[PDB]
Design a protein around this ligand. Structure first.
Ligand SMILES: [Mg+2]
Ligand SMILES: [Mg+2]
Lengths: 289, 289
Protein backbone atom coordinates (compact mmCIF):
# COMPACT_ATOMS: atom_id res chain seq x y z
CA UNK A 1 0.00 0.00 0.00
CA UNK A 2 1.70 3.13 -1.34
CA UNK A 3 -1.25 5.55 -1.88
CA UNK A 4 -0.99 5.82 -5.69
CA UNK A 5 -3.36 7.98 -7.82
CA UNK A 6 -5.29 5.40 -9.89
CA UNK A 7 -5.48 6.26 -13.62
CA UNK A 8 -4.48 5.37 -17.21
CA UNK A 9 -3.07 1.90 -17.90
CA UNK A 10 -2.86 0.87 -14.23
CA UNK A 11 -6.57 1.69 -13.76
CA UNK A 12 -7.56 -0.45 -16.73
CA UNK A 13 -5.47 -3.35 -15.45
CA UNK A 14 -6.58 -3.16 -11.80
CA UNK A 15 -10.26 -2.98 -12.79
CA UNK A 16 -9.67 -5.50 -15.57
CA UNK A 17 -8.31 -8.04 -13.07
CA UNK A 18 -10.93 -7.26 -10.41
CA UNK A 19 -13.62 -9.90 -10.04
CA UNK A 20 -15.73 -7.69 -7.77
CA UNK A 21 -15.89 -4.36 -5.94
CA UNK A 22 -17.05 -3.82 -2.37
CA UNK A 23 -18.27 -0.29 -1.71
CA UNK A 24 -18.80 1.70 1.45
CA UNK A 25 -21.88 3.95 0.91
CA UNK A 26 -21.79 7.31 2.74
CA UNK A 27 -18.99 9.54 1.46
CA UNK A 28 -18.57 7.20 -1.56
CA UNK A 29 -21.82 6.75 -3.48
CA UNK A 30 -23.46 9.84 -2.00
CA UNK A 31 -23.21 12.50 0.71
CA UNK A 32 -26.59 12.73 2.46
CA UNK A 33 -29.20 13.67 -0.13
CA UNK A 34 -26.72 14.06 -2.98
CA UNK A 35 -25.42 11.22 -5.17
CA UNK A 36 -21.82 11.58 -6.30
CA UNK A 37 -22.30 12.45 -9.99
CA UNK A 38 -21.21 9.44 -12.07
CA UNK A 39 -21.64 6.94 -9.25
CA UNK A 40 -24.83 5.30 -10.62
CA UNK A 41 -23.06 4.99 -13.99
CA UNK A 42 -20.03 3.24 -12.52
CA UNK A 43 -22.30 0.63 -10.95
CA UNK A 44 -24.10 0.12 -14.30
CA UNK A 45 -20.79 -0.34 -16.19
CA UNK A 46 -19.55 -2.74 -13.47
CA UNK A 47 -22.66 -4.89 -14.03
CA UNK A 48 -21.99 -4.78 -17.81
CA UNK A 49 -18.28 -5.69 -17.48
CA UNK A 50 -17.98 -8.75 -15.26
CA UNK A 51 -18.10 -7.82 -12.21
CA UNK A 52 -19.81 -8.20 -8.82
CA UNK A 53 -20.79 -5.23 -6.67
CA UNK A 54 -21.55 -5.52 -2.97
CA UNK A 55 -22.16 -2.79 -0.34
CA UNK A 56 -20.72 -2.79 3.17
CA UNK A 57 -22.07 -0.20 5.63
CA UNK A 58 -21.63 0.42 9.38
CA UNK A 59 -25.25 1.69 9.48
CA UNK A 60 -27.24 0.38 12.46
CA UNK A 61 -30.01 2.98 12.27
CA UNK A 62 -32.37 1.37 9.74
CA UNK A 63 -33.24 -2.20 8.80
CA UNK A 64 -32.12 -3.45 5.40
CA UNK A 65 -35.36 -2.94 3.44
CA UNK A 66 -35.22 0.75 4.45
CA UNK A 67 -31.47 1.10 3.82
CA UNK A 68 -32.09 -0.36 0.33
CA UNK A 69 -34.49 2.56 -0.36
CA UNK A 70 -31.66 5.07 -0.37
CA UNK A 71 -30.18 3.43 -3.48
CA UNK A 72 -33.33 3.85 -5.60
CA UNK A 73 -33.97 7.35 -4.18
CA UNK A 74 -30.43 8.47 -5.07
CA UNK A 75 -30.66 7.05 -8.58
CA UNK A 76 -29.02 3.64 -8.17
CA UNK A 77 -31.38 1.15 -9.87
CA UNK A 78 -31.14 -2.60 -10.51
CA UNK A 79 -29.88 -3.48 -7.05
CA UNK A 80 -31.00 -6.44 -4.96
CA UNK A 81 -31.37 -6.25 -1.17
CA UNK A 82 -29.00 -9.23 -0.81
CA UNK A 83 -26.09 -7.08 -2.08
CA UNK A 84 -26.26 -4.89 1.05
CA UNK A 85 -24.47 -5.69 4.29
CA UNK A 86 -24.94 -3.47 7.34
CA UNK A 87 -23.54 -3.70 10.86
CA UNK A 88 -27.16 -4.10 12.04
CA UNK A 89 -27.73 -7.17 9.87
CA UNK A 90 -24.33 -8.61 10.72
CA UNK A 91 -24.72 -7.92 14.47
CA UNK A 92 -27.94 -9.95 14.43
CA UNK A 93 -26.12 -12.87 12.78
CA UNK A 94 -23.19 -12.71 15.19
CA UNK A 95 -25.53 -12.74 18.20
CA UNK A 96 -27.46 -15.71 16.74
CA UNK A 97 -24.08 -17.50 16.29
CA UNK A 98 -22.70 -16.59 19.72
CA UNK A 99 -25.51 -16.50 22.03
CA UNK A 100 -24.11 -18.05 25.23
CA UNK A 101 -27.12 -19.72 26.81
CA UNK A 102 -28.37 -23.26 27.16
CA UNK A 103 -29.99 -24.34 23.97
CA UNK A 104 -33.34 -23.17 24.82
CA UNK A 105 -32.79 -20.69 26.46
CA UNK A 106 -29.95 -18.83 24.75
CA UNK A 107 -31.39 -16.01 25.80
CA UNK A 108 -32.12 -12.19 25.74
CA UNK A 109 -30.31 -9.15 24.18
CA UNK A 110 -30.32 -5.73 25.84
CA UNK A 111 -30.16 -3.28 22.95
CA UNK A 112 -28.91 0.31 22.92
CA UNK A 113 -30.37 1.38 19.62
CA UNK A 114 -33.42 2.17 17.57
CA UNK A 115 -36.40 0.40 16.00
CA UNK A 116 -34.60 -0.55 12.76
CA UNK A 117 -31.85 -2.28 14.71
CA UNK A 118 -34.46 -4.02 16.85
CA UNK A 119 -36.40 -5.18 13.77
CA UNK A 120 -33.22 -6.81 12.33
CA UNK A 121 -32.50 -8.58 15.61
CA UNK A 122 -36.05 -9.98 15.92
CA UNK A 123 -35.90 -11.12 12.27
CA UNK A 124 -32.79 -13.17 13.08
CA UNK A 125 -34.90 -14.85 15.77
CA UNK A 126 -33.33 -13.01 18.74
CA UNK A 127 -35.22 -12.30 21.95
CA UNK A 128 -34.90 -8.66 23.17
CA UNK A 129 -34.92 -7.39 26.77
CA UNK A 130 -37.40 -4.59 25.95
CA UNK A 131 -40.06 -6.96 24.58
CA UNK A 132 -43.29 -8.36 26.21
CA UNK A 133 -42.81 -11.39 28.51
CA UNK A 134 -44.89 -14.59 28.61
CA UNK A 135 -38.14 -11.73 32.69
CA UNK A 136 -35.51 -13.66 30.65
CA UNK A 137 -31.84 -13.58 31.57
CA UNK A 138 -29.94 -10.99 29.52
CA UNK A 139 -27.00 -12.69 27.86
CA UNK A 140 -25.75 -9.88 25.59
CA UNK A 141 -25.65 -6.13 25.51
CA UNK A 142 -25.57 -4.72 22.02
CA UNK A 143 -24.40 -1.09 21.55
CA UNK A 144 -25.63 0.42 18.25
CA UNK A 145 -26.43 3.92 17.00
CA UNK A 146 -28.70 5.07 19.79
CA UNK A 147 -30.16 8.59 19.40
CA UNK A 148 -31.87 8.05 22.74
CA UNK A 149 -28.77 6.96 24.68
CA UNK A 150 -29.00 8.00 28.36
CA UNK A 151 -27.21 7.64 31.64
CA UNK A 152 -30.07 5.37 32.77
CA UNK A 153 -29.57 2.99 29.81
CA UNK A 154 -25.79 3.11 30.40
CA UNK A 155 -26.33 2.15 34.06
CA UNK A 156 -28.68 -0.72 33.07
CA UNK A 157 -26.21 -1.94 30.44
CA UNK A 158 -23.52 -2.11 33.13
CA UNK A 159 -25.84 -4.04 35.50
CA UNK A 160 -26.27 -6.75 32.83
CA UNK A 161 -22.51 -6.84 32.18
CA UNK A 162 -21.69 -7.61 35.86
CA UNK A 163 -22.30 -11.18 34.71
CA UNK A 164 -18.99 -12.02 33.05
CA UNK A 165 -20.83 -14.52 30.78
CA UNK A 166 -22.98 -11.72 29.36
CA UNK A 167 -21.54 -10.68 25.98
CA UNK A 168 -20.70 -7.08 25.08
CA UNK A 169 -21.11 -6.39 21.36
CA UNK A 170 -20.84 -3.14 19.39
CA UNK A 171 -22.22 -2.67 15.86
CA UNK A 172 -19.24 -0.44 15.00
CA UNK A 173 -16.66 2.00 16.48
CA UNK A 174 -17.22 5.00 14.19
CA UNK A 175 -16.63 7.99 16.53
CA UNK A 176 -18.81 10.50 14.68
CA UNK A 177 -20.46 11.16 11.30
CA UNK A 178 -20.66 14.32 9.17
CA UNK A 179 -24.02 15.82 8.24
CA UNK A 180 -25.02 17.95 5.20
CA UNK A 181 -24.99 21.26 7.09
CA UNK A 182 -21.34 20.73 8.16
CA UNK A 183 -22.14 19.57 11.70
CA UNK A 184 -21.40 16.13 13.17
CA UNK A 185 -23.44 13.53 15.00
CA UNK A 186 -21.78 11.29 17.63
CA UNK A 187 -21.27 7.73 16.40
CA UNK A 188 -21.59 4.30 17.99
CA UNK A 189 -17.90 4.36 18.87
CA UNK A 190 -18.59 7.18 21.34
CA UNK A 191 -21.43 5.21 22.97
CA UNK A 192 -19.35 2.03 22.98
CA UNK A 193 -16.53 3.98 24.70
CA UNK A 194 -18.93 4.93 27.53
CA UNK A 195 -20.19 1.36 27.94
CA UNK A 196 -16.68 -0.18 27.90
CA UNK A 197 -15.35 2.37 30.36
CA UNK A 198 -18.19 2.06 32.89
CA UNK A 199 -18.33 -1.76 32.67
CA UNK A 200 -14.54 -2.28 32.48
CA UNK A 201 -15.00 -4.50 29.41
CA UNK A 202 -13.90 -4.64 25.76
CA UNK A 203 -16.64 -4.94 23.16
CA UNK A 204 -16.71 -7.46 20.34
CA UNK A 205 -17.00 -5.19 17.26
CA UNK A 206 -19.24 -6.34 14.38
CA UNK A 207 -18.69 -3.76 11.61
CA UNK A 208 -15.66 -2.45 9.74
CA UNK A 209 -12.77 -2.47 10.43
CA UNK A 210 -13.56 -5.79 12.11
CA UNK A 211 -13.03 -8.72 9.72
CA UNK A 212 -16.32 -10.22 10.97
CA UNK A 213 -18.21 -8.19 8.36
CA UNK A 214 -16.21 -9.98 5.65
CA UNK A 215 -17.07 -13.36 7.19
CA UNK A 216 -20.69 -12.25 7.25
CA UNK A 217 -20.41 -11.32 3.54
CA UNK A 218 -18.59 -14.53 2.54
CA UNK A 219 -21.28 -16.65 4.20
CA UNK A 220 -23.52 -15.67 1.27
CA UNK A 221 -21.10 -14.97 -1.60
CA UNK A 222 -17.86 -16.46 -2.76
CA UNK A 223 -15.42 -13.59 -2.93
CA UNK A 224 -11.71 -13.89 -3.55
CA UNK A 225 -10.25 -11.00 -1.53
CA UNK A 226 -7.08 -11.00 -3.67
CA UNK A 227 -9.34 -10.19 -6.66
CA UNK A 228 -11.67 -7.77 -4.86
CA UNK A 229 -11.45 -3.97 -4.57
CA UNK A 230 -12.47 -2.25 -1.29
CA UNK A 231 -13.63 1.31 -1.88
CA UNK A 232 -14.13 3.73 1.01
CA UNK A 233 -13.70 7.28 2.29
CA UNK A 234 -12.60 6.52 5.87
CA UNK A 235 -9.02 5.26 6.45
CA UNK A 236 -9.50 3.88 9.96
CA UNK A 237 -12.71 2.07 8.98
CA UNK A 238 -12.82 1.19 5.25
CA UNK A 239 -9.14 1.02 4.34
CA UNK A 240 -8.11 -0.87 7.52
CA UNK A 241 -11.01 -3.26 6.85
CA UNK A 242 -9.64 -3.80 3.32
CA UNK A 243 -6.08 -4.59 4.51
CA UNK A 244 -7.35 -6.93 7.24
CA UNK A 245 -9.32 -8.82 4.57
CA UNK A 246 -6.49 -8.90 2.00
CA UNK A 247 -8.33 -6.70 -0.50
CA UNK A 248 -6.92 -4.02 -2.79
CA UNK A 249 -8.01 -0.73 -1.22
CA UNK A 250 -9.12 2.48 -2.92
CA UNK A 251 -9.63 5.71 -0.98
CA UNK A 252 -12.15 8.09 -2.47
CA UNK A 253 -11.85 11.74 -1.54
CA UNK A 254 -15.54 12.63 -1.49
CA UNK A 255 -15.87 11.74 2.23
CA UNK A 256 -14.29 11.83 5.68
CA UNK A 257 -10.56 11.12 5.19
CA UNK A 258 -8.10 13.45 3.44
CA UNK A 259 -5.21 12.58 1.12
CA UNK A 260 -2.94 14.35 3.63
CA UNK A 261 -3.86 11.89 6.42
CA UNK A 262 -3.22 8.93 4.06
CA UNK A 263 0.20 10.34 3.17
CA UNK A 264 0.95 11.07 6.85
CA UNK A 265 0.30 7.43 7.77
CA UNK A 266 2.55 6.30 4.88
CA UNK A 267 5.44 8.39 6.26
CA UNK A 268 4.87 6.95 9.73
CA UNK A 269 5.00 3.48 8.12
CA UNK A 270 1.45 2.66 9.30
CA UNK A 271 0.74 0.62 6.18
CA UNK A 272 -2.62 -0.81 7.32
CA UNK A 273 -4.10 2.71 7.23
CA UNK A 274 -2.65 3.53 3.79
CA UNK A 275 -4.76 2.82 0.71
CA UNK A 276 -3.28 1.05 -2.32
CA UNK A 277 -4.89 3.73 -4.54
CA UNK A 278 -6.96 6.88 -4.34
CA UNK A 279 -9.37 8.69 -6.62
CA UNK A 280 -10.97 12.14 -6.35
CA UNK A 281 -14.37 10.42 -6.68
CA UNK A 282 -15.53 6.99 -7.81
CA UNK A 283 -16.57 8.54 -11.17
CA UNK A 284 -12.84 8.40 -11.98
CA UNK A 285 -13.05 4.59 -11.95
CA UNK A 286 -15.58 4.23 -14.78
CA UNK A 287 -13.12 4.88 -17.67
CA UNK A 288 -11.18 1.81 -16.48
CA UNK A 289 -13.93 -0.52 -17.68
CA UNK B 1 6.62 2.35 47.03
CA UNK B 2 6.75 -1.29 48.14
CA UNK B 3 3.21 -1.92 49.51
CA UNK B 4 4.17 -2.52 53.16
CA UNK B 5 1.61 -3.32 55.91
CA UNK B 6 1.79 -0.26 58.21
CA UNK B 7 2.06 -1.13 61.92
CA UNK B 8 4.18 -1.11 65.12
CA UNK B 9 7.26 1.12 65.24
CA UNK B 10 7.10 2.13 61.56
CA UNK B 11 3.50 3.34 62.02
CA UNK B 12 4.45 5.48 65.00
CA UNK B 13 7.35 7.01 63.09
CA UNK B 14 5.49 7.64 59.81
CA UNK B 15 2.57 9.28 61.64
CA UNK B 16 4.98 10.97 64.03
CA UNK B 17 6.81 12.63 61.13
CA UNK B 18 3.62 13.46 59.21
CA UNK B 19 2.64 17.11 59.30
CA UNK B 20 -0.76 16.41 57.73
CA UNK B 21 -3.01 13.75 56.21
CA UNK B 22 -5.07 14.10 53.04
CA UNK B 23 -8.02 11.73 52.92
CA UNK B 24 -10.20 10.48 50.10
CA UNK B 25 -13.77 10.07 51.48
CA UNK B 26 -15.82 7.26 49.90
CA UNK B 27 -14.33 3.83 50.64
CA UNK B 28 -12.09 5.44 53.32
CA UNK B 29 -14.12 7.35 55.92
CA UNK B 30 -17.38 5.61 55.05
CA UNK B 31 -19.15 3.38 52.54
CA UNK B 32 -22.48 4.99 51.64
CA UNK B 33 -24.53 5.34 54.82
CA UNK B 34 -22.00 3.57 57.04
CA UNK B 35 -18.98 5.22 58.67
CA UNK B 36 -15.90 3.02 58.96
CA UNK B 37 -15.88 2.27 62.71
CA UNK B 38 -12.98 4.17 64.28
CA UNK B 39 -12.73 6.73 61.49
CA UNK B 40 -14.23 9.66 63.44
CA UNK B 41 -11.82 8.81 66.29
CA UNK B 42 -8.76 8.89 64.04
CA UNK B 43 -9.69 12.38 62.88
CA UNK B 44 -10.15 13.52 66.52
CA UNK B 45 -6.73 12.11 67.55
CA UNK B 46 -5.12 13.73 64.47
CA UNK B 47 -6.48 17.11 65.60
CA UNK B 48 -5.10 16.43 69.11
CA UNK B 49 -1.63 15.36 67.87
CA UNK B 50 -0.36 17.99 65.46
CA UNK B 51 -1.63 17.44 62.58
CA UNK B 52 -3.65 18.86 59.67
CA UNK B 53 -6.46 16.93 58.00
CA UNK B 54 -7.81 17.81 54.56
CA UNK B 55 -10.31 15.93 52.33
CA UNK B 56 -9.93 15.43 48.58
CA UNK B 57 -12.93 14.05 46.68
CA UNK B 58 -13.75 13.52 42.98
CA UNK B 59 -17.42 14.26 43.80
CA UNK B 60 -19.11 16.59 41.30
CA UNK B 61 -22.68 15.74 42.29
CA UNK B 62 -23.24 18.16 45.19
CA UNK B 63 -21.93 21.60 46.07
CA UNK B 64 -19.58 21.90 49.03
CA UNK B 65 -22.08 22.97 51.72
CA UNK B 66 -24.06 19.79 50.95
CA UNK B 67 -20.98 17.56 50.70
CA UNK B 68 -19.94 18.91 54.14
CA UNK B 69 -23.25 17.56 55.56
CA UNK B 70 -22.17 13.97 55.07
CA UNK B 71 -19.39 14.43 57.64
CA UNK B 72 -21.72 15.53 60.46
CA UNK B 73 -24.36 12.93 59.45
CA UNK B 74 -21.78 10.12 59.57
CA UNK B 75 -20.43 11.23 62.93
CA UNK B 76 -17.44 13.36 61.94
CA UNK B 77 -17.75 16.59 63.98
CA UNK B 78 -15.50 19.66 64.30
CA UNK B 79 -14.81 20.00 60.59
CA UNK B 80 -14.74 23.24 58.63
CA UNK B 81 -16.02 23.51 55.05
CA UNK B 82 -12.63 24.90 53.96
CA UNK B 83 -11.00 21.50 54.65
CA UNK B 84 -12.97 19.89 51.80
CA UNK B 85 -11.84 19.89 48.19
CA UNK B 86 -14.06 18.42 45.48
CA UNK B 87 -13.59 18.13 41.72
CA UNK B 88 -16.68 20.38 41.39
CA UNK B 89 -15.09 23.18 43.44
CA UNK B 90 -11.74 22.75 41.72
CA UNK B 91 -13.28 22.59 38.22
CA UNK B 92 -14.92 25.96 38.88
CA UNK B 93 -11.55 27.45 39.87
CA UNK B 94 -9.76 25.98 36.86
CA UNK B 95 -12.38 27.38 34.48
CA UNK B 96 -12.15 30.82 36.16
CA UNK B 97 -8.33 30.63 35.69
CA UNK B 98 -8.44 29.36 32.10
CA UNK B 99 -11.36 30.85 30.52
CA UNK B 100 -10.15 31.68 26.99
CA UNK B 101 -12.18 34.74 26.05
CA UNK B 102 -11.51 38.45 25.77
CA UNK B 103 -11.57 39.99 29.17
CA UNK B 104 -15.14 40.73 29.20
CA UNK B 105 -16.32 38.43 27.65
CA UNK B 106 -14.50 35.27 28.76
CA UNK B 107 -17.37 33.65 28.26
CA UNK B 108 -19.89 30.73 28.73
CA UNK B 109 -19.56 27.10 30.02
CA UNK B 110 -21.68 24.26 28.63
CA UNK B 111 -22.12 21.89 31.56
CA UNK B 112 -22.88 18.17 31.52
CA UNK B 113 -23.87 17.78 35.13
CA UNK B 114 -26.33 18.51 37.88
CA UNK B 115 -27.55 21.43 39.99
CA UNK B 116 -24.82 21.14 42.65
CA UNK B 117 -22.12 21.35 40.01
CA UNK B 118 -23.91 24.31 38.43
CA UNK B 119 -24.21 26.09 41.79
CA UNK B 120 -20.41 25.80 42.34
CA UNK B 121 -19.67 27.17 38.88
CA UNK B 122 -21.99 30.18 39.32
CA UNK B 123 -20.44 30.85 42.75
CA UNK B 124 -17.01 31.10 41.11
CA UNK B 125 -18.54 33.78 38.88
CA UNK B 126 -18.85 31.59 35.76
CA UNK B 127 -21.53 32.14 33.13
CA UNK B 128 -23.39 28.93 32.10
CA UNK B 129 -24.89 28.08 28.69
CA UNK B 130 -28.17 26.88 30.24
CA UNK B 131 -28.86 30.17 32.03
CA UNK B 132 -31.22 33.11 31.11
CA UNK B 133 -29.82 35.62 28.57
CA UNK B 134 -29.96 39.44 28.76
CA UNK B 135 -26.74 33.82 23.41
CA UNK B 136 -23.10 34.02 24.66
CA UNK B 137 -20.31 32.16 22.92
CA UNK B 138 -19.57 28.83 24.63
CA UNK B 139 -15.87 28.70 25.45
CA UNK B 140 -15.73 25.51 27.54
CA UNK B 141 -17.53 22.23 27.84
CA UNK B 142 -17.36 20.75 31.30
CA UNK B 143 -18.12 17.00 31.71
CA UNK B 144 -19.13 16.12 35.30
CA UNK B 145 -21.28 13.43 36.93
CA UNK B 146 -24.39 13.76 34.81
CA UNK B 147 -27.29 11.45 35.76
CA UNK B 148 -29.22 13.00 32.88
CA UNK B 149 -26.54 12.49 30.20
CA UNK B 150 -28.11 11.95 26.76
CA UNK B 151 -27.21 11.57 23.13
CA UNK B 152 -28.70 15.04 22.55
CA UNK B 153 -26.39 16.64 25.16
CA UNK B 154 -23.45 14.67 23.72
CA UNK B 155 -24.26 15.99 20.23
CA UNK B 156 -24.53 19.59 21.56
CA UNK B 157 -21.25 19.22 23.45
CA UNK B 158 -19.56 18.19 20.21
CA UNK B 159 -21.05 21.17 18.33
CA UNK B 160 -19.43 23.54 20.84
CA UNK B 161 -16.10 21.68 20.59
CA UNK B 162 -15.89 22.16 16.78
CA UNK B 163 -14.33 25.47 17.81
CA UNK B 164 -10.76 24.41 18.59
CA UNK B 165 -10.51 27.35 21.07
CA UNK B 166 -13.38 25.93 23.13
CA UNK B 167 -11.92 24.09 26.14
CA UNK B 168 -12.83 20.52 27.05
CA UNK B 169 -12.66 19.89 30.80
CA UNK B 170 -13.62 16.83 32.86
CA UNK B 171 -14.18 16.90 36.63
CA UNK B 172 -12.63 13.41 36.91
CA UNK B 173 -12.06 10.11 35.04
CA UNK B 174 -13.51 7.67 37.58
CA UNK B 175 -15.08 4.95 35.36
CA UNK B 176 -17.73 3.77 37.83
CA UNK B 177 -18.65 3.82 41.53
CA UNK B 178 -19.92 1.06 43.85
CA UNK B 179 -23.25 1.41 45.63
CA UNK B 180 -24.45 -0.11 48.95
CA UNK B 181 -26.55 -2.86 47.32
CA UNK B 182 -23.49 -4.17 45.40
CA UNK B 183 -24.39 -2.55 42.08
CA UNK B 184 -22.38 0.13 40.25
CA UNK B 185 -23.19 3.52 38.79
CA UNK B 186 -21.29 4.78 35.71
CA UNK B 187 -18.77 7.51 36.55
CA UNK B 188 -17.68 10.72 34.86
CA UNK B 189 -14.85 8.86 33.16
CA UNK B 190 -17.41 6.94 31.10
CA UNK B 191 -19.16 10.18 30.05
CA UNK B 192 -15.82 11.86 29.36
CA UNK B 193 -14.87 8.86 27.15
CA UNK B 194 -18.00 9.44 25.03
CA UNK B 195 -17.34 13.18 24.69
CA UNK B 196 -13.63 12.73 23.82
CA UNK B 197 -14.39 10.02 21.28
CA UNK B 198 -17.18 11.88 19.47
CA UNK B 199 -15.32 15.22 19.47
CA UNK B 200 -11.86 13.74 18.74
CA UNK B 201 -10.41 15.69 21.68
CA UNK B 202 -8.57 15.02 24.96
CA UNK B 203 -10.10 16.50 28.10
CA UNK B 204 -8.22 18.52 30.70
CA UNK B 205 -8.89 16.52 33.90
CA UNK B 206 -9.51 18.46 37.14
CA UNK B 207 -9.72 15.78 39.87
CA UNK B 208 -7.42 13.00 41.06
CA UNK B 209 -5.17 11.59 39.72
CA UNK B 210 -4.54 14.97 38.06
CA UNK B 211 -2.06 17.07 40.06
CA UNK B 212 -4.32 20.10 39.52
CA UNK B 213 -6.32 19.14 42.62
CA UNK B 214 -3.12 19.49 44.68
CA UNK B 215 -2.49 22.93 43.16
CA UNK B 216 -6.07 23.81 44.02
CA UNK B 217 -5.44 22.64 47.62
CA UNK B 218 -2.07 24.41 47.95
CA UNK B 219 -3.63 27.70 46.83
CA UNK B 220 -5.30 27.81 50.26
CA UNK B 221 -2.98 25.80 52.52
CA UNK B 222 0.74 25.36 52.81
CA UNK B 223 1.35 21.65 52.59
CA UNK B 224 4.73 19.99 52.31
CA UNK B 225 4.02 16.90 50.19
CA UNK B 226 7.14 15.16 51.53
CA UNK B 227 5.55 15.41 55.01
CA UNK B 228 1.97 14.62 53.96
CA UNK B 229 0.17 11.26 53.87
CA UNK B 230 -2.30 10.51 51.04
CA UNK B 231 -4.93 8.00 52.10
CA UNK B 232 -7.24 6.34 49.57
CA UNK B 233 -8.98 3.16 48.46
CA UNK B 234 -8.51 3.48 44.68
CA UNK B 235 -5.03 2.80 43.20
CA UNK B 236 -5.56 4.45 39.82
CA UNK B 237 -7.08 7.57 41.40
CA UNK B 238 -5.86 8.14 44.99
CA UNK B 239 -2.50 6.37 45.01
CA UNK B 240 -1.43 7.68 41.56
CA UNK B 241 -2.48 11.16 42.73
CA UNK B 242 -0.24 10.71 45.80
CA UNK B 243 2.84 9.67 43.78
CA UNK B 244 2.33 12.50 41.27
CA UNK B 245 2.27 14.94 44.20
CA UNK B 246 5.26 13.41 46.03
CA UNK B 247 3.20 12.29 49.03
CA UNK B 248 3.55 9.12 51.09
CA UNK B 249 0.61 6.95 50.03
CA UNK B 250 -1.54 4.64 52.14
CA UNK B 251 -4.04 2.25 50.59
CA UNK B 252 -6.99 1.37 52.77
CA UNK B 253 -8.81 -1.86 52.03
CA UNK B 254 -12.33 -0.76 52.89
CA UNK B 255 -13.02 0.42 49.31
CA UNK B 256 -12.55 -0.24 45.60
CA UNK B 257 -8.98 -1.55 45.16
CA UNK B 258 -7.71 -4.91 46.44
CA UNK B 259 -4.33 -5.76 47.97
CA UNK B 260 -3.92 -8.28 45.11
CA UNK B 261 -4.09 -5.52 42.46
CA UNK B 262 -1.52 -3.44 44.41
CA UNK B 263 0.82 -6.44 44.57
CA UNK B 264 0.22 -7.22 40.87
CA UNK B 265 1.31 -3.69 39.89
CA UNK B 266 4.41 -4.05 42.10
CA UNK B 267 5.44 -7.22 40.23
CA UNK B 268 4.89 -5.47 36.90
CA UNK B 269 7.13 -2.65 38.21
CA UNK B 270 4.31 -0.07 37.84
CA UNK B 271 5.49 1.84 40.90
CA UNK B 272 3.15 4.84 40.49
CA UNK B 273 0.16 2.55 41.14
CA UNK B 274 1.75 0.90 44.19
CA UNK B 275 1.06 2.37 47.63
CA UNK B 276 3.89 2.95 50.12
CA UNK B 277 1.72 1.32 52.81
CA UNK B 278 -1.63 -0.33 53.30
CA UNK B 279 -4.02 -0.81 56.19
CA UNK B 280 -7.16 -2.95 56.53
CA UNK B 281 -9.04 0.22 57.52
CA UNK B 282 -8.01 3.68 58.67
CA UNK B 283 -8.87 2.66 62.27
CA UNK B 284 -5.51 0.85 62.18
CA UNK B 285 -3.77 4.23 61.95
CA UNK B 286 -5.04 5.64 65.27
CA UNK B 287 -2.65 3.65 67.54
CA UNK B 288 0.24 5.39 65.74
CA UNK B 289 -0.59 8.71 67.39
MG1 LIG C 1 -18.15 6.19 4.29
MG1 LIG D 1 -12.59 6.47 47.48
Amino acid sequence: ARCERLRGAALRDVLGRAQGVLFDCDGVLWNGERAVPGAPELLERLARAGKAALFVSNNSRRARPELALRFARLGFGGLRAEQLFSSALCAARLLRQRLPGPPDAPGAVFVLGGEGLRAELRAAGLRLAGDPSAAPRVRAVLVGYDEHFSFAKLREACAHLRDPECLLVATDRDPWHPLSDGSRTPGTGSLAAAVETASGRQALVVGKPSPYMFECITENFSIDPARTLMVGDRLETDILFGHRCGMTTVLTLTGVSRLEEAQAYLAAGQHDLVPHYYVESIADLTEGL
